[PDB]
Amino acid sequence: DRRALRIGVNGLPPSLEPINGISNTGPRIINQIFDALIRRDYFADGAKGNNIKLVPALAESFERIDDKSIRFKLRQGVKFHNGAEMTAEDVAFTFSSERLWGDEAIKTVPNGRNFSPNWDEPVVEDKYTVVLRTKTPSYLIEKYLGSWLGPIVPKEYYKSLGAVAFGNKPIGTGPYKFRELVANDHVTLEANDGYWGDKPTASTITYQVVAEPATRVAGLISGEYDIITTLTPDDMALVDGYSDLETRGTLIENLHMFTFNMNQPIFQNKTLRRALALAVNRPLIVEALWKNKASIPNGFNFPHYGATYDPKRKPMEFNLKEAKRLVKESGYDGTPITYHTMGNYYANAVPALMMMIEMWKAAGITVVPKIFAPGTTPKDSDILIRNWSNGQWLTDGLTTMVSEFGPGRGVQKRWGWKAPAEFNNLCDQVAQLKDGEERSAAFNRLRDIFEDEAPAVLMYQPYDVYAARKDVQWSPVSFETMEFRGNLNFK
């Protein structure tokens, strides 16, 4: 009675364990197998899949009891896919030092401490009540639990298999249960008719890897796929021309940028980093390669940040004479600077780079491409400039300016950014502060420091394009995932 759903995808994650599967390709599958305590309700109040409203999901109700603790009252009688009942022991295990943020845990789940606030050990008060708490103040616990950190795992099944084996045979409470995985080929899920929420509308969901965008578009035309992912604005006209097919695009909460190896003499000072930033003409790149669909953020600042989004912050400056002042004052002698890119792993990376090289040539800077094929692992010492992307994964300003560029993180520790003292003092404060005038003002000093220091240069917020058959009613969300709850109906 229910149709099977076939999705032609760019790739599969390295794991289906919630944290180890975090990637461009994992959440779209993980979001079906699992539930979190809190759910982001993207379509609430008629919003076009970009709402930041958080609602209870596996938690029946919850109350913030102090600046660092939340008492969760869980839904009772909810079952995981293996028949086990979801209790406070499973929720406590999900955010425990043993599984997620302990020294031993991060050797099997490397980003468990990185994608978490400063957690303290959960407290099980009774079978269905757990307090999730942070060691120091945190008014972001709710946002973290409604993010990709949130999926609740079964304690006893997860511990008998271990994180690695659990990632290949996952068990959750979600609307679709795991059926099979064929590495680098496909994942098939089947309807969970015992689901506590609404009945699943597809009998099965298959995520089939089709690496080439054109082969993926061909599969949708022929009837091999119902929905296809990872297209660009340049692919829209061909798909929209067909009467029974259409494109469904959205601005995603991701940031395309380029960053520097600041250990290197040429990039230890901010002077040349700023010159490269002040010489990039972002509207011309967005106009020529993204059909004007990509958005240029007005700083390290996006609407989904909520209380910490500043709509009055002015655009990032494009001043060629100021760049030329910095290139000359830096003592730059015309030595070629390489720009590493793994081809077009990020959409339009090579075309955007070729446009930026000519802009950089006007500021008296010589930059050369260094296109390395997938498989070639370049050494850190060989990197001057490299392209990068960052998923803006909390519905808050903390991610990624504080979470990636802050103290003790890769940009400063691995890539040698010597951030000013104020930046690392304000980073630790905004993690502990409550929303208001003080926190919002502190996010502007962090943004001002970021632009003047230029440890990275933000390019734009990419426009993600999906294509689907018109007889499949499903709307994209503004994040790198797929939501089918209240959003998947077959005509």
PDB file of all heavy atoms in Angstrom, residues 422-434:
ATOM      1  N   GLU A 422      41.649  39.081  23.777  1.00  0.00           N
ATOM      2  CA  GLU A 422      40.224  39.405  23.864  1.00  0.00           C
ATOM      3  C   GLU A 422      39.347  38.362  23.156  1.00  0.00           C
ATOM      4  O   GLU A 422      38.263  38.063  23.650  1.00  0.00           O
ATOM      5  CB  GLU A 422      39.953  40.791  23.249  1.00  0.00           C
ATOM      6  CG  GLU A 422      38.515  41.275  23.383  1.00  0.00           C
ATOM      7  CD  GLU A 422      38.214  42.630  22.778  1.00  0.00           C
ATOM      8  OE1 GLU A 422      39.107  43.190  22.106  1.00  0.00           O
ATOM      9  OE2 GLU A 422      37.083  43.134  22.971  1.00  0.00           O
ATOM     10  N   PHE A 423      39.788  37.842  21.991  1.00  0.00           N
ATOM     11  CA  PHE A 423      39.023  36.849  21.243  1.00  0.00           C
ATOM     12  C   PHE A 423      38.824  35.585  22.072  1.00  0.00           C
ATOM     13  O   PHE A 423      37.703  35.102  22.162  1.00  0.00           O
ATOM     14  CB  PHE A 423      39.708  36.505  19.898  1.00  0.00           C
ATOM     15  CG  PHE A 423      38.868  35.674  18.951  1.00  0.00           C
ATOM     16  CD1 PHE A 423      38.010  36.280  18.049  1.00  0.00           C
ATOM     17  CD2 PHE A 423      39.004  34.295  18.904  1.00  0.00           C
ATOM     18  CE1 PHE A 423      37.229  35.516  17.189  1.00  0.00           C
ATOM     19  CE2 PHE A 423      38.242  33.538  18.032  1.00  0.00           C
ATOM     20  CZ  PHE A 423      37.348  34.151  17.191  1.00  0.00           C
ATOM     21  N   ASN A 424      39.889  35.054  22.675  1.00  0.00           N
ATOM     22  CA  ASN A 424      39.788  33.836  23.480  1.00  0.00           C
ATOM     23  C   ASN A 424      39.126  34.027  24.832  1.00  0.00           C
ATOM     24  O   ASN A 424      38.655  33.041  25.400  1.00  0.00           O
ATOM     25  CB  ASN A 424      41.146  33.182  23.636  1.00  0.00           C
ATOM     26  CG  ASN A 424      41.682  32.615  22.345  1.00  0.00           C
ATOM     27  OD1 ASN A 424      41.006  32.607  21.298  1.00  0.00           O
ATOM     28  ND2 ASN A 424      42.905  32.100  22.386  1.00  0.00           N
ATOM     29  N   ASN A 425      39.071  35.270  25.346  1.00  0.00           N
ATOM     30  CA  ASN A 425      38.355  35.569  26.580  1.00  0.00           C
ATOM     31  C   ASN A 425      36.867  35.693  26.237  1.00  0.00           C
ATOM     32  O   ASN A 425      36.039  35.144  26.963  1.00  0.00           O
ATOM     33  CB  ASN A 425      38.891  36.852  27.254  1.00  0.00           C
ATOM     34  CG  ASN A 425      40.240  36.663  27.908  1.00  0.00           C
ATOM     35  OD1 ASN A 425      40.733  35.535  28.066  1.00  0.00           O
ATOM     36  ND2 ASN A 425      40.879  37.763  28.313  1.00  0.00           N
ATOM     37  N   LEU A 426      36.517  36.375  25.127  1.00  0.00           N
ATOM     38  CA  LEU A 426      35.117  36.513  24.715  1.00  0.00           C
ATOM     39  C   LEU A 426      34.527  35.188  24.175  1.00  0.00           C
ATOM     40  O   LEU A 426      33.310  35.031  24.193  1.00  0.00           O
ATOM     41  CB  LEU A 426      34.925  37.605  23.644  1.00  0.00           C
ATOM     42  CG  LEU A 426      35.160  39.065  24.026  1.00  0.00           C
ATOM     43  CD1 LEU A 426      35.070  39.951  22.786  1.00  0.00           C
ATOM     44  CD2 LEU A 426      34.156  39.557  25.070  1.00  0.00           C
ATOM     45  N   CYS A 427      35.362  34.269  23.663  1.00  0.00           N
ATOM     46  CA  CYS A 427      34.879  32.978  23.171  1.00  0.00           C
ATOM     47  C   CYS A 427      34.343  32.153  24.359  1.00  0.00           C
ATOM     48  O   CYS A 427      33.221  31.649  24.297  1.00  0.00           O
ATOM     49  CB  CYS A 427      35.982  32.228  22.423  1.00  0.00           C
ATOM     50  SG  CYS A 427      36.176  32.722  20.690  1.00  0.00           S
ATOM     51  N   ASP A 428      35.143  32.043  25.439  1.00  0.00           N
ATOM     52  CA  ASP A 428      34.775  31.318  26.655  1.00  0.00           C
ATOM     53  C   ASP A 428      33.575  31.957  27.367  1.00  0.00           C
ATOM     54  O   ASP A 428      32.763  31.242  27.977  1.00  0.00           O
ATOM     55  CB  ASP A 428      35.990  31.227  27.602  1.00  0.00           C
ATOM     56  CG  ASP A 428      37.140  30.378  27.069  1.00  0.00           C
ATOM     57  OD1 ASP A 428      37.008  29.825  25.950  1.00  0.00           O
ATOM     58  OD2 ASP A 428      38.180  30.280  27.760  1.00  0.00           O
ATOM     59  N   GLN A 429      33.438  33.286  27.270  1.00  0.00           N
ATOM     60  CA  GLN A 429      32.310  33.978  27.873  1.00  0.00           C
ATOM     61  C   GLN A 429      31.009  33.725  27.106  1.00  0.00           C
ATOM     62  O   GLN A 429      30.003  33.429  27.741  1.00  0.00           O
ATOM     63  CB  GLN A 429      32.562  35.493  27.959  1.00  0.00           C
ATOM     64  CG  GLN A 429      33.545  35.902  29.053  1.00  0.00           C
ATOM     65  CD  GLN A 429      33.264  37.312  29.510  1.00  0.00           C
ATOM     66  OE1 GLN A 429      32.548  37.534  30.498  1.00  0.00           O
ATOM     67  NE2 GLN A 429      33.803  38.294  28.791  1.00  0.00           N
ATOM     68  N   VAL A 430      31.000  33.851  25.760  1.00  0.00           N
ATOM     69  CA  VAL A 430      29.760  33.636  24.992  1.00  0.00           C
ATOM     70  C   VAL A 430      29.241  32.193  25.133  1.00  0.00           C
ATOM     71  O   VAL A 430      28.048  32.001  25.017  1.00  0.00           O
ATOM     72  CB  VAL A 430      29.793  34.085  23.503  1.00  0.00           C
ATOM     73  CG1 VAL A 430      30.023  35.590  23.381  1.00  0.00           C
ATOM     74  CG2 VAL A 430      30.815  33.299  22.669  1.00  0.00           C
ATOM     75  N   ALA A 431      30.093  31.203  25.432  1.00  0.00           N
ATOM     76  CA  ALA A 431      29.629  29.836  25.673  1.00  0.00           C
ATOM     77  C   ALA A 431      28.836  29.742  27.007  1.00  0.00           C
ATOM     78  O   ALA A 431      27.884  28.956  27.103  1.00  0.00           O
ATOM     79  CB  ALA A 431      30.814  28.889  25.714  1.00  0.00           C
ATOM     80  N   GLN A 432      29.231  30.554  28.016  1.00  0.00           N
ATOM     81  CA  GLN A 432      28.634  30.596  29.356  1.00  0.00           C
ATOM     82  C   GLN A 432      27.477  31.595  29.536  1.00  0.00           C
ATOM     83  O   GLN A 432      26.620  31.383  30.394  1.00  0.00           O
ATOM     84  CB  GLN A 432      29.732  30.890  30.391  1.00  0.00           C
ATOM     85  CG  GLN A 432      30.731  29.748  30.547  1.00  0.00           C
ATOM     86  CD  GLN A 432      31.839  30.089  31.493  1.00  0.00           C
ATOM     87  OE1 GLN A 432      31.847  29.660  32.648  1.00  0.00           O
ATOM     88  NE2 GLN A 432      32.804  30.870  31.026  1.00  0.00           N
ATOM     89  N   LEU A 433      27.442  32.658  28.737  1.00  0.00           N
ATOM     90  CA  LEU A 433      26.435  33.716  28.832  1.00  0.00           C
ATOM     91  C   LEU A 433      25.053  33.336  28.304  1.00  0.00           C
ATOM     92  O   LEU A 433      24.910  32.477  27.431  1.00  0.00           O
ATOM     93  CB  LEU A 433      26.911  34.989  28.077  1.00  0.00           C
ATOM     94  CG  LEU A 433      27.648  36.121  28.833  1.00  0.00           C
ATOM     95  CD1 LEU A 433      28.672  35.608  29.875  1.00  0.00           C
ATOM     96  CD2 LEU A 433      28.328  37.063  27.836  1.00  0.00           C
ATOM     97  N   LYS A 434      24.033  34.033  28.825  1.00  0.00           N
ATOM     98  CA  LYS A 434      22.642  33.926  28.409  1.00  0.00           C
ATOM     99  C   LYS A 434      22.401  34.963  27.297  1.00  0.00           C
ATOM    100  O   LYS A 434      23.071  35.989  27.263  1.00  0.00           O
ATOM    101  CB  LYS A 434      21.749  34.229  29.626  1.00  0.00           C
ATOM    102  CG  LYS A 434      20.263  33.989  29.439  1.00  0.00           C
ATOM    103  CD  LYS A 434      19.573  34.147  30.786  1.00  0.00           C
ATOM    104  CE  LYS A 434      18.077  34.055  30.728  1.00  0.00           C
ATOM    105  NZ  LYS A 434      17.487  34.258  32.087  1.00  0.00           N
TER     106      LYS A 434
END
